[PDB]
């Protein structure tokens, strides 16, 4: 796990660049698992809304440096969407609105892998439009208010992969980060599953979803295990088994599709069920 230098003191995850051995079969395998998850949710009466997060390197190509991503990454976002469609998985396009939103300010942090709070809010709004368009939610709307607090420097997660403290003067300038918190005006109908994009309060993706959906949302995202393991954990949970939500939003950044997931802790019989759900 490493970092790639861009222009103007931008940093990227090399996971958005590196080739992966056996990437084709890994993508196949992950898609079969995603499809099995979709079918499992549907069988419990939950609608899956897959949220494919585009790579920072795809959204900010203008800050690419000398190194460019390998060919695997050229059309990964598009192929993920195409395969999700083949699998009858509902996956609203997040790339077009995030790209539109670059004119307003940064939709990703310069020195960090993650979307900015504004970037996450754009994604939440796109997802909420799609949810409304498909009538996936019923129930009385609940109103939420998001308040913007102070802005302060933020050291990005990628800076720690840089080479050594004798060279601290070479580190890129910290990002700036605006605090944003969401509160209600005053069984949960929506569950959120995903990665640090969803688990980390700094990006306020949960709050942005609550506000955009006009619905309470429960967070089952986790930091540091990729997008699949927290979803499998959720499916095995008492929360899901005893109170399946109307909608599950599954945040799944594109770079994880051709990456291996450690399934060693799961029953192979259950893994088999997921892959063979059709």
Numbering used by the authors: 79 to 241, 243 to 265, 279 to 370
Paper text:
The O-acetylation of alginate requires the concerted action of four proteins: the putative MBOAT protein, AlgI; a protein of unknown function, AlgF; and two annotated O-acetyltransferases AlgJ and AlgX. AlgI is predicted to be a member of the MBOAT family, while AlgJ and AlgX are required in the O-acetylation of alginate as the polymer passages through the periplasm. The TMHMM server v2.0 indicates that AlgJ from P. aeruginosa PAO1 possesses a transmembrane helix from residues 12–29 that tethers the periplasmic domain to the cytoplasmic membrane; a prediction that is supported by in vivo localization studies. AlgJ exhibits acetylesterase activity that is mediated through the Ser-His-Asp catalytic triad similar to that of the SGNH hydrolase-like enzyme AlgX.
To this end, we have determined the structure of Pseudomonas putida AlgJ75–370 (PpAlgJ75–370) to 1.83 Å resolution and have functionally characterized the protein. Selenomethionine-incorporated (SeMet) protein was expressed, purified, crystallized, and the structure determined to 1.83 Å using the single-wavelength anomalous dispersion (SAD) technique. PpAlgJ75–370 crystallized in space group C2 with two molecules in the asymmetric unit. The dimer observed in the crystal structure is therefore not believed to be biologically relevant. SGNH hydrolases have an α/β/α fold with each of the four conserved active site residues responsible for catalysis residing in one of four conserved blocks. The structure of PpAlgJ75–370 reveals that the protein has an α/β/α fold with a core of four parallel β-strands and an isolated β-bridge at β3, which are comparable to the five parallel β-strands found in canonical SGNH hydrolases. A surface representation of PpAlgJ75–370 reveals a shallow groove that crosses the face of the protein (left, centre). In PpAlgJ the corresponding residues D190 and H192 are located in the shallow electronegative groove (centre). The active site of PpAlgJ75–370 and the orientation of the putative catalytic triad D190, H192 and S288, is analogous to PaAlgX27–474 and other serine esterases and proteases. Examination of the PpAlgJ75–370 structure suggests that Y348 is in a position to act as a hydrogen bond donor in place of the conserved asparagine. AlgJ appears to be a circularly permuted member of SGNH hydrolases as the order of conserved residues in primary sequence (H-S-G-Y) is different than that of SGNH hydrolases (S-G-N-H).
